[PDB]
Structures are given as structure tokens and as C-alpha cells.
């Protein structure tokens, strides 16, 4: 068997679910490949890890992979373009989450000074738009009372614990985390204005608007205006055209087995998307498969 490991994220995140079930899903197709998800600190230490032939696919975001691709704009990746990525598909919208307990003295991003915040995990997209979206709110690291970067499970539970104020994701609506803090725990999320980042477009021009509705977490009732990414299934440009083609009749030939995997895909993913506004490259497996299925032209 050809072996893949795809990246993804913490464990009670969007990404590990998703790269579990696309394992499961490929090898249940007896197509000659043995695949497993391997949970990580997210998009950054994904690409980083396909770059080094440590994996040959991974979940990541569509911001972080043009940066990759292109070698600019965060630093982690100014300098040295990241040419070895490919795009396979579009998934669904990764909503930047901004978690406060009740009790903090926290409204806005503007509150955030002096606080103690969990600003993603190392190697995260997470930390990447924290970082962007302070700045947009005049703020830096530096300014946050403590800026802690731990797994999506750790980090849920500082926020239990009160050993931290707020929490940051970039993440698929309805990630466990979040709704697991969401049932112990007084929280509300912040708002982030897209005109304060619209300010900062041109830099970063990969977040739109995005609305998460009342009651998708426990105790959140009020909707919560923010910005949102797209996350993408990428893959490394080593793997062969076929290996590709095949893994992706297995996984986007089967749809609604696909949508099953999780409730964002039911939700957000459809064939003609997952091939829209794409960062970089798609991978000539990909490109076969899209084109015979009628989404090319
Ligand atoms: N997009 C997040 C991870 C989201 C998830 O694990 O679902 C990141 O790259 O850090």
C-alpha cells in the first residue's frame, strides 16, 4: 500500500475529525492507499510538514497556504516560498472565534489588554489572525497580560480553570472544544469588525464577513458578528497524478458519504465550491478529477 498521513489539528477541533473520517473513507475504498490523520498544532505546522515530506497532505487554511505559496505577509513563511503545496478542494468556512469568560471584563478585542489569552496553538493559523486582528484593535502581544499557545483541549481547559480569559480559534463552526466550554462554563464571544481588518484587505485579503447564529453554543444566544477563512484539503506536489486521481474519486466521488464525516460539510461543501477562489495550485489529480467531473471545464 501507498501510505498518507494528513495533518489536521487538535483533537476536538474541525480538522482531526474531518482527516479521520477522509482516512476512513479512502481506505474503505480499497484503492491501494493507507491513510491516517495525525493530529497537529494546525495550518502552519501542516504546510511545514509537507514541505519536509513528513506529511503528504494536510487540512489548512486558504490565508495561510497564498502565504506558504507565496513566501510573504506572515513569518513563518517570509523569505521562502513554500512551492511543494497543492490545493485538492475547498472545504467549508473557518470562523474566527473569539471566546471570553463572563467574568473577565472583556466586551470587545479592545479589552484584551492586560488579560491573559490563549492566542492558538504553536504552528497554528489560529495565532496567525490573533495576531492580525489585535493589531487591528491597536493591540500586540505584548499588550495581552500573558499570550499562551496550547492545544484546542488545553486550552478549554484554562478557560474552565480560570487560568486564562479568552481563547481565540480559527475554526469550523461546532467544534467539540468550544461546545464542550461552552456546557461548563459562563462564556460569550467577542465580535471582530471586519472594517477594522477591511482596513488591513489588502495585506490579508482572504477574510469575509461571517455571522455565527444564536444558540449555536450553550449560553451564546446572541448572534456574534466576526470574520471568517475557508478551509482547504491540500497535499503534497510529490504525490503522483494517479494517487491523487484515485484518492479523490475516493473521497469527493463519494458525496454523500463525504458529507457525512461532519455536519460543516453537510452544511457548506459542494463540488462547484471546493474548486472557487483557490490560493494555489491545484494538484493534476485533482484538475483530472474535477474536469471529468463536469466542475472544470
Ligand atoms: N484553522 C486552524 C485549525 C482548525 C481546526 O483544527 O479545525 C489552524 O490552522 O490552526
Given at each position: 500500500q501507498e501510505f498518507i498521513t494528513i495533518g489536521s489539528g487538535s483533537?476536538?477541533?474541525?480538522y482531526f475529525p474531518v482527516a479521520t473520517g477522509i482516512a476512513k473513507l479512502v481506505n474503505d475504498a480499497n484503492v491501494g492507499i493507507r491513510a491516517n490523520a495525525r493530529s497537529t498544532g494546525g495550518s502552519v505546522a501542516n504546510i511545514n510538514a509537507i514541505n519536509a515530506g513528513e506529511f503528504e497532505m494536510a487540512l489548512a487554511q486558504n490565508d495561510i497556504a497564498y502565504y506558504a505559496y507565496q513566501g510573504?505577509?506572515?513569518?513563518?513563511?517570509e523569505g521562502k516560498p513554500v512551492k511543494t503545496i497543492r490545493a485538492l478542494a475547498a472545504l467549508y468556512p473557518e470562523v474566527v472565534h473569539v471566546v471570553a469568560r463572563?467574568?473577565?471584563?472583556?466586551?470587545?478585542?479592545?479589552?484584551?489588554?492586560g488579560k491573559r489569552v490563549?492566542?492558538?496553538?504553536?504552528?497554528?493559523?489560529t495565532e496567525q489572525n490573533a495576531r492580525q486582528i489585535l493589531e487591528a484593535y491597536?493591540?500586540?502581544?505584548?499588550?495581552?497580560?500573558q499570550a499562551i499557545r496550547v492545544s484546542a483541549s488545553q486550552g478549554i481547559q484554562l478557560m474552565q480553570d480560570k487560568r486564562a480569559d479568552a481563547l481565540f480559534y480559527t475554526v469550523g463552526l461546532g467544534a467539540s472544544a468550544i461546545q464542550q466550554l461552552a456546557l461548563t462554563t459562563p462564556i460569550a464571544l467577542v465580535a471582530v469588525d471586519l472594517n477594522r481588518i477591511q482596513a488591513i484587505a489588502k495585506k490579508y485579503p482572504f477574510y469575509v464577513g461571517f455571522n455565527i447564529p444564536?444558540?449555536?453554543?450553550?449560553?451564546?444566544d446572541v448572534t456574534t458578528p466576526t470574520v471568517a477563512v475557508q478551509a482547504m484539503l491540500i497535499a503534497s506536489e510529490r504525490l503522483s497524478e494517479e494517487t491523487v486521481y484515485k484518492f479523490m474519486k475516493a473521497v469527493f466521488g463519494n458525496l454523500e458519504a463525504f458529507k457525512k464525516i461532519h455536519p460543516n460539510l453537510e452544511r457548506f461543501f459542494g463540488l462547484e465550491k471546493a474548486?472557487?477562489?483557490?490560493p494555489i495550485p491545484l494538484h493534476p489529480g485533482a484538475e483530472r478529477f474535477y474536469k471529468e467531473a463536469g466542475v472544470l471545464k
Open positions: 483533537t476536538t477541533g474541525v510573504c505577509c506572515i513569518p513563518a513563511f463572563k467574568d473577565a471584563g472583556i466586551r470587545t478585542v479592545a479589552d484584551l489588554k490563549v492566542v492558538g496553538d504553536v504552528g497554528s493559523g491597536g493591540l500586540t502581544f505584548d499588550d495581552l497580560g444564536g444558540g449555536t453554543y450553550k449560553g451564546v474548486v472557487k477562489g483557490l
